[PDB]
């Protein structure tokens, strides 16, 4: 499913993402925008290390979800990577929460550092009523 901007904003708010571990909704929106373009079936294979990023938040199979084919993998979030490809983003939200429960926080995603960090991210939630 490809979410519309405001539709995603409200869904994430309802999931308790606004301010989770100090991360504003606008930041989670910025991350989703650049990681997947708000697309839940987005998958990206990393040939270099044989891991795959899954879903709207591009969650990595090496540490957060289990896909069985990733070398030296762990299942920190304790989920099947399949769960991060559903239209319902509840599991993706719970996984994203687990990722940021580590000291790096939102910085775990390098795309966040490149396009979101130290930027005016208000544009991601403007007009959405959140």
From Swiss-Prot:
GO molecular function, one term: identical protein binding
Active site: 35, 53
UniProt keyword list: Amyloid, Amyloidosis, Antimicrobial, Bacteriolytic enzyme, Disease variant, Disulfide bond, Glycosidase, Hydrolase, Secreted, Signal
A GO-annotated cellular component: extracellular region
Cystines in this chain: 6-128, 30-116, 65-81, 77-95
Subunit structure: Monomer.
Family: Belongs to the glycosyl hydrolase 22 family.
PANTHER family in the record: LYSOZYME C (PTHR11407:SF28)
Function noted in UniProt: Lysozymes have primarily a bacteriolytic function; those in tissues and body fluids are associated with the monocyte-macrophage system and enhance the activity of immunoagents.
Protein name stated in the entry: Lysozyme C
The species this protein was found in: Homo sapiens
